[PDB]
């Protein structure tokens, strides 16, 4: 399908995934 | 050069030495003669090391190691950019930026490995503290203050109390001063001075005062015999400076590992470069392929992992106050095939205290523990309190006022060491000695001297009423026994018996067998019928009684072994680490402390002990019978290298005593020549050269001088030996952990080489790019690799043999098999699976990718037919290739999850040892975070060549990362169930 | 050195380890081929799963040139021999002899017609039929050149070729008084194509371009679309457009830009061949 596979949306989702994983990982160090 | 003579003209009398330098014994020397002899022999300032590399160390470090290849790759990137700017279209920055970042990588690696290879050796500036600037000399019959820099050889130098001597001199006239060397011999015990040549050895002769020492009590004059570099301790300084250091075991292992990996990398690179040239690639293609191979096979982000592992080791062990100077030393203490030890300071408290006593025909052990653990002795017995009175009264030392804020065992007191020990024991036992001395006023006393060997003092009674005059007496046991007539037991007074005297002699011999200078006490209450209160008291004229006294008790005051040294030494020996004791003290005390501490085990005896037990001369008994041997330093001068090696090989627990510092260096070199890794511990200036020669040098913090502590690889600030046993256990731990981290990092090399191998051997589009190789190496092999350094190893460390320094290398042929053979292949297989999945999800069937690379990377063609029938232009398919690069990187991270999970432990499974490491989970989460961030950040594809990928493609590596986990668990299960098998031999890295 | 005839090459006996690695690599290859076959099972044979990476097609040109510039002396046959041989080799497939009736090819609309389909992508129907592209549409040079007459009549006709995409029908613009003013063009069934590079800056209209293709209008016929794949539409011939220059001067480096507009055609920045097309013409006497 020539219409965008989601681009400009998968970037937001990927950034959200990265930041939430970083937050979860950095939580364990302090706790 | 080797300098181990230290010869001095001690035997020659004063006139010969005065004439040989043509120097007046009574008029000193003239100014003109001093000038013309200074113009020959030079100034007294010992020569500092001339070579002072300022920044050439950093340049040499960046030029060497595992880099040359990185510089070659950077040069090739610059060459490729130059080629692309003269033949191709408008120049692209994708190669110049790669070269710049590669140069940045090599610079950061060089400046980061510089942190560990920092030779912190500044022993030159530790000797200016001695030899004070001003010295009192006798020139032209006149006393003169003169600078210590221009004092020459052959001039009268006076020596007062507390003034360190300016040069090695033979005393011409000794005026009652006592000197304590504490430099070459290494003890606080003072020594007498006399022009007579008492001993043939210049070290033990009493007519010389050694350099950088002060005759503590009194004043004496002499003639300088040598100064400057021709000085015994100047010779020691030069030997220490020119000795340099030996490569640490971690340095040797890292050098070998880098050599092996660089050799493999260059071999494979040149092989496939000539293969590509044969295949018919253009120069740009060949150079870019070579750059890819070089940057992929070489693990650039690896020498930055071991450094941080060692830094984390230092941080962890610094919480126990082990100030690590050389970063590599933390590893060396693990190996320590043998450990050399010192007598004073390291194993003792450096000061003498009471250890044993005898009364009521009974031996009582003075307790080093402050609470008197184990009911050491009674405290309510009248005989004991009387003995405490006697020991307290006879002291001629006084505690410093207002120093009650420190425990009594750590308070400095001015006076003799023996009386200091006695008064410290009395203070610890009874209480405030000052109030005690105030209660009993002194009215008459007799000085203590060698010609007397006894001292006496007349005091009153504790109760104010009936102040009977008590004459207290302290001396050698034999003299007091001879002067004695009755014995005091439990307050009552009995008379001497032949059996009682025999028992006293037996006890005295038993105490003397402990290498201690036993003292005997006495006290007589003068009758008031003959010696009333109004009795005249004198010193030179005798008016007291000398015989018909009454013995009260013996007293032992050996310097005690440390509180935590015996158990720690036992633990070190139980870990397979042989312990050798070296010192410059007397052999009897050395053997006594060796037996007490635990260096020589119970039931093992030396050759002389067997000879004495069997009443047979030492010649007729074979030395092979005795495993433990103790030797003097006088026969070591007549010992060659072969003799020392034989002594080390045969005898199992040795103790060396009365050894000069150069002899200590000879001993440590002989110990190291047997293939061992020697670790010497000490605190004095004498063992400063030896501390440099040993692979790791340990110096005591509080009890050690500045020279010893700044010449050591590690300083024990807490000054505890349990610290060093914890250190060796932790060194074993960090070695076993490094052997896992290195294996982890190396496994990622195969999935970065194999894509190039298929790109050159199968003609398929490039699966893995070049910049993404940097991304993988420095982004996904850094945080987990460092986090691996935190987990504690298996519980087998209690029953582990010392590391063999020539068979158990850091990286061996059995670890390359685990990384490059099995674990690495699954990584590349998963990467290729993701490659083929996403190339097959866009139109390129996996069965057609062969033979398409020639037209895939061609710039001109813009109608490349895929498998489904459609066609692509250049950038339109280059976008797909870049997306596939991102997929390869993501799949690498996904499979590195399981790689970390399975490389966590060598034997114990994850289900058994458990994921108790709080930092490994954070590292695993960080692998995902950076991978997602770096593959999805907008505005990055134009620079880092990183395109977004669909969520489903995140799952491509799941059914292969699962396989490697199961495979490693199965091999670990086989390992556990079948010890010593073929699997253990060929797969246990 | 690694001695032999005493104990062996670095111990070994080189059988247990070699057999272990051989069987392990065999198992790795087996699991890899099984997994790749499994992945092959979940992908269709009639359409790519993700066609996003395929954009509005790049308007590539048929005369293949390395340096993206056409330089030749018109008086020397060897100067343009490479271009002529490439053009004729490409267009040998488009000869009317290869196109025949009786379920090989089929007649198709002379006037640009609607984008007629043939059926679903499913394999329940065999090879779908396609139109035919006779060489008789090409001409306007007053000579039967077909492939190419080979003379120095200006320049060798650089016939453009809009790249084909599986299951994609171009959408022509529909509006009045648009950004372009072609005299002979209608909104449907034709995709406007113009050829001019840097007009009025440095080019200043050096030459006059004449377009000839199907329908006597400068555009790609829409009745040929959509493509149905390599397996389902063998011997598929896609629309072709021909351009010629007559009053083209010499001794100058002129850039020429041949672009095709469309509501379903989008442009880019980093791609210099997607949608719009660029080429240089060099002629020297």
From Swiss-Prot, chain A:
Similarity field: Belongs to the FXYD family.
Superkingdom per UniProt: Eukaryota
Transmembrane segments: 9-30
Purpose of the protein: Associates with and regulates the activity of the sodium/potassium-transporting ATPase (NKA) which catalyzes the hydrolysis of ATP coupled with the exchange of Na(+) and K(+) ions across the plasma membrane. Reduces the apparent affinity for intracellular Na(+) with no change in the apparent affinity for extracellular K(+). In addition to modulating NKA kinetics, may also function as a regulator of NKA localization to the plasma membrane.
Complex and partners: Regulatory subunit of the sodium/potassium-transporting ATPase which is composed of a catalytic alpha subunit, a non-catalytic beta subunit and an additional regulatory subunit. The regulatory subunit, a member of the FXYD protein family, modulates the enzymatic activity in a tissue- and isoform-specific way by changing affinities of the Na+/K+-ATPase toward Na(+), K(+) or ATP.
Protein name listed in UniProt: FXYD domain-containing ion transport regulator 6
Subcellular location: Cell membrane
From Swiss-Prot, chain B:
Gene Ontology terms describing biological process: cell communication by electrical coupling involved in cardiac conduction; cellular response to amyloid-beta; cellular response to steroid hormone stimulus; intracellular potassium ion homeostasis; intracellular sodium ion homeostasis; neuron projection maintenance; potassium ion import across plasma membrane; proton transmembrane transport
Top-rank EC class of the record's enzyme: translocase
Predominant location category: membrane
Membrane-side (Cytoplasmic) residue stretches: 1-53, 119-254, 305-738, 790-809, 905-917, 973-989
Outcome of swapping residue 268 to R: In DEE99; decreased affinity for sodium ions; decreased affinity for potassium ions
Family membership: Belongs to the cation transport ATPase (P-type) (TC 3.A.3) family. Type IIC subfamily.
Entry protein name: Sodium/potassium-transporting ATPase subunit alpha-3
UniProt organism field: Homo sapiens
Lineage: Eukaryota, Metazoa, Chordata, Craniata, Vertebrata
Curated annotation (Swiss-Prot), chain C:
GO MF annotations in UniProt: ATPase activator activity; ATPase binding; MHC class II protein complex binding; P-type sodium:potassium-exchanging transporter activity; protein heterodimerization activity; protein kinase binding; protein-macromolecule adaptor activity; transporter activator activity
Transmembrane segments: 17-44
Ranges per topology, Extracellular: 45-285
PTM comment text: Glutathionylated. N-glycosylated.
Modified residues (Phosphotyrosine): 83
Localization terms from the record: Cell membrane; Apical cell membrane; Cell membrane, Sarcolemma
Distribution of this protein across tissues and organs: Found in most tissues.
Gene3D superfamilies, per database record: 1.20.5.170, Na, k-atpase alpha subunit (2.60.40.1660)
Membrane topology note: Single-pass type II membrane protein
Primary localization class, coarse: membrane
One GO term describing the cellular component: lateral plasma membrane
Domain of life: Eukaryota
Disulphide bond pairs: 108-131, 141-157, 195-258
GO biological process: ATP metabolic process; cardiac muscle contraction; cell adhesion; cell communication by electrical coupling involved in cardiac conduction; establishment or maintenance of transmembrane electrochemical gradient; innate immune response; intracellular calcium ion homeostasis; intracellular potassium ion homeostasis
Tagged with keyword tRNA-binding: no
The keyword Transmembrane is annotated on this UniProt entry: yes
Keyword annotations from UniProtKB, A to Z: Cell adhesion, Cell membrane, Disulfide bond, Glutathionylation, Glycoprotein, Immunity, Innate immunity, Ion transport, Membrane, Phosphoprotein, Potassium, Potassium transport, Signal-anchor, Sodium, Sodium transport, Sodium/potassium transport, Transmembrane, Transmembrane helix, Transport
Database matches in PROSITE patterns: ATPASE_NA_K_BETA_1, ATPASE_NA_K_BETA_2
Short name of any one Pfam family annotated for the protein: Na_K-ATPase
Database matches in InterPro entries: Na/K_ATPase_sub_beta, Na/K_ATPase_sub_beta_sf
Residue numbers spanned by region immunoglobulin-like: 173-285
Comment, domains: The C-terminal lobe folds into an immunoglobulin-like domain and mediates cell adhesion properties.
Family per record: Belongs to the X(+)/potassium ATPases subunit beta family.
Protein name, per record: Sodium/potassium-transporting ATPase subunit beta-1
UniProt source species: Homo sapiens (Human)
Gene name linked to the record: ATP1B1
């Amino acid at each position: 399908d020539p219409f965008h596979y989601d681009y400009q949306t998968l970037r937001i989702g990927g950034l959200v995934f990265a930041v939430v994983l970083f937050s979860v990982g950095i939580l364990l160090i302090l706790s | 050069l080797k300098k181990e003579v230290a010869m001095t003209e001690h035997k020659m009398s004063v006139e010969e030495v005065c004439r040989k330098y043509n120097t007046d014994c009574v008029q000193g020397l003239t100014h003109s003669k001093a000038q013309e002899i200074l113009a020959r022999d030079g100034p007294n300032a010992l020569t500092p090391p001339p070579t002072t590399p300022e920044w050439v160390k950093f340049c040499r470090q960046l030029f060497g190691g595992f880099s040359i290849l990185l510089w070659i790759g950077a040069i090739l990137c610059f060459l490729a950019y130059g080629i692309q700017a003269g033949t191709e279209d408008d120049p692209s920055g994708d190669n110049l930026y790669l070269g710049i970042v590669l140069a940045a990588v090599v610079i950061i690696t060089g400046c980061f490995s510089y942190y560990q290879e920092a030779k912190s050796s500044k022993i030159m500036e530790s000797f200016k503290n001695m030899v004070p600037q001003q010295a009192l000399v006798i020139r032209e019959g006149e006393k003169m203050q003169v600078n210590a820099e221009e004092v020459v050889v052959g001039d009268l130098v006076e020596i007062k109390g507390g003034d360190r001597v300016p040069a090695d001199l033979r005393i011409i006239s000794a005026h009652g001063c006592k000197v304590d060397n504490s430099s070459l011999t290494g003890e606080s015990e003072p020594q007498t001075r006399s022009p007579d040549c008492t001993h043939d050895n210049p070290l033990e002769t009493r007519n010389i005062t050694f350099f950088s020492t002060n005759c503590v009590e009194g004043t004496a004059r002499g003639v300088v015999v040598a100064t400057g570099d021709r000085t015994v301790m100047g010779r020691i300084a030069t030997l220490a400076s020119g000795l340099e250091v030996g490569k640490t075991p971690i340095a040797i292992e890292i050098e070998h590992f880098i050599q092996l990996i660089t050799g493999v990398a260059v071999f494979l690179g040149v092989s496939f470069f000539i293969l590509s040239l044969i295949l018919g690639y253009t120069w740009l293609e060949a150079v870019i392929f070579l750059i890819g191979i070089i940057v992929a096979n070489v693990p650039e982000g690896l020498l930055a992992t071991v450094t941080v592992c060692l830094t984390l080791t230092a941080k962890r062990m610094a919480r126990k106050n082990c100030l690590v100077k050389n970063l590599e030393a933390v590893e060396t203490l693990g190996s320590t095939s043998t450990i050399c030890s010192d007598k004073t300071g390291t194993l003792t408290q450096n000061r003498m205290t009471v250890a044993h006593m005898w009364f009521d025909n009974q031996i009582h052990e003075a307790d080093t523990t402050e609470d008197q653990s184990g009911t050491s002795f009674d405290k309510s017995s009248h005989t004991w309190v009387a003995l405490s009175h006697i020991a307290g009264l006879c002291n001629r030392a006084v505690f410093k006022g207002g120093q009650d804020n420190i425990p009594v065992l750590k308070r400095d007191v001015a006076g003799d060491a023996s009386e200091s020990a006695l008064l410290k024991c009395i203070e610890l036992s009874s209480g405030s000695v000052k109030l005690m001395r105030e209660r009993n006023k002194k009215v008459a006393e007799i000085p203590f001297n060698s010609t007397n060997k006894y001292q006496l003092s007349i005091h009153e009674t504790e109760d104010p009423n009936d102040n009977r005059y008590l004459l207290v007496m302290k001396g050698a046991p034999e003299r007091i026994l001879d002067r004695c007539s009755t014995i005091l037991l439990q307050g009552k007074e009995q008379p001497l018996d032949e059996e009682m005297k025999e028992a006293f002699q037996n006890a005295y011999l038993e105490l003397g067998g402990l290498g201690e200078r036993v003292l005997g006490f006495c006290h007589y209450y003068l009758p008031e019928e003959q010696f009333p209160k109004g009795f005249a008291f004198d010193c030179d004229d005798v008016n007291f009684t000398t015989d018909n006294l009454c013995f009260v008790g013996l007293m032992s005051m050996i310097d005690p072994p440390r509180a935590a040294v015996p158990d720690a030494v036992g633990k070190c020996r139980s870990a397979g680490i042989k312990v050798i004791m070296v010192t410059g003290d007397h052999p009897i005390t050395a053997k006594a402390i060796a037996k007490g501490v635990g260096i020589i085990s119970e039931g093992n005896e030396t050759v002389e002990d067997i000879a004495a037990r069997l009443n047979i001369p030492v010649s007729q008994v074979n030395p092979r019978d005795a495993k433990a041997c103790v030797i003097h330093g006088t026969d070591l001068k007549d010992f060659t290298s072969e003799q020392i090696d034989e002594i080390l090989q045969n005898h199992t627990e040795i103790v060396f005593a009365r050894t000069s510092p150069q002899q200590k260096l000879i001993i440590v070199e002989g110990c190291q020549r047997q293939g061992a890794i020697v670790a010497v511990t000490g605190d004095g200036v004498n063992d400063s050269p030896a501390l440099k020669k040993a692979d790791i040098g340990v110096a005591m913090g509080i009890a050690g001088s500045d020279v010893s502590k700044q010449a050591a690889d590690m300083i024990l600030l807490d000054d505890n030996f349990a610290s060093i046993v914890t250190g060796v256990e932790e060194g074993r731990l960090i070695f076993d952990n490094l052997k896992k981290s290195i294996a982890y990092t190396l496994t990622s090399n195969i999935p970065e080489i194999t894509p190039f191998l298929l790109f050159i051997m199968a003609n398929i589009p490039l699966p893995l790019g070049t910049i993404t190789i940097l991304c993988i190496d420095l982004g996904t092999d850094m945080v987990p690799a460092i986090s691996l350094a935190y987990e504690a190893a298996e519980s087998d460390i209690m029953k582990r043999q010392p590391r063999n320094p020539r068979t158990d290398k850091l990286v061996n042929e059995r670890l390359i098999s685990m990384a490059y053979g099995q674990i690495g292949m699954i990584q590349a297989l998963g990467g290729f699976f993701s490659y083929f999945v996403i190339l097959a999800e866009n139109g390129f069937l996996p069965g057609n990718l062969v033979g398409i690379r020639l037209n895939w990377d061609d710039r001109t063609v813009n109608d490349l037919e895929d498998s489904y029938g459609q066609q692509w232009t250049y950038e339109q398919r280059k976008v797909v290739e870049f997306t596939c690069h991102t997929a390869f990187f993501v799949s690498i991270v996904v499979v590195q999850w399981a790689d970390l999970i399975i490389c966590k432990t060598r034997r114990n499974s994850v289900f058994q040892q458990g994921m108790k490491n709080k930092i490994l989970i954070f590292g695993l989460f960080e692998e995902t975070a950076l991978a997602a961030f770096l593959s999805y950040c907008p505005g990055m594809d134009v620079a880092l060549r990183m395109y977004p990928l669909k969520p489903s493609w995140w799952f491509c590596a799941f059914p292969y990362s699962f396989l490697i986990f199961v495979y490693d668990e199965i091999r670990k299960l086989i390992l556990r169930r079948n010890p010593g098998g073929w699997v253990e031999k060929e797969t246990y890295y | 050195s690694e001695k032999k005839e005493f104990l062996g090459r670095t111990g070994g006996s080189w059988f247990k380890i070699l057999l272990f690695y051989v069987i392990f690599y065999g198992c790795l290859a087996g699991i890899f081929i099984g997994t790749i076959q499994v992945m092959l099972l979940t992908i269709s044979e009639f359409k790519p799963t993700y066609q996003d990476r395929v954009a509005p097609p790049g308007l590539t040109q048929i005369p293949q040139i390395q340096k993206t510039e056409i330089s030749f002396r018109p008086n020397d046959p060897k100067s343009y021999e490479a271009y002529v041989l490439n053009i004729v080799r490409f267009l040998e497939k488009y000869k009317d002899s290869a196109q025949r009736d009786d379920m090989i090819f089929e007649d198709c609309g002379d006037v640009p017609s609607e984008p007629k389909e043939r059926g679903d992508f499913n394999h329940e129907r065999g090879e779908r039929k396609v139109c035919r592209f006779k060489l008789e549409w090409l001409g306007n040079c007053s000579g039967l050149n077909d492939e190419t007459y080979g003379y120095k009549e200006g320049k060798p006709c650089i016939i453009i070729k809009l790249n084909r995409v599986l299951g994609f029908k171009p959408k022509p613009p529909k509006n009045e008084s648009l950004e372009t003013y072609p005299v002979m063009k209608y909104n449907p069934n034709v995709l406007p194509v113009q050829c001019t590079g840097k007009r009025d800056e440095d080019k200043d209209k050096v030459g006059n371009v004449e377009y000839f293709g199907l329908g006597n209008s400068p555009g790609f016929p829409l009745q040929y679309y959509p493509y149905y794949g390599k397996l389902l539409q063998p011997k598929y011939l896609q629309p072709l457009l021909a351009v010629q220059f007559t009053n083209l001067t010499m001794d100058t480096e002129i850039r020429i830009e041949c672009k095709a507009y469309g509501e379903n055609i989008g442009y880019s920045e980093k791609d210099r061949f997607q949608g719009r097309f660029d080429v240089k013409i060099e002629v020297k006497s």
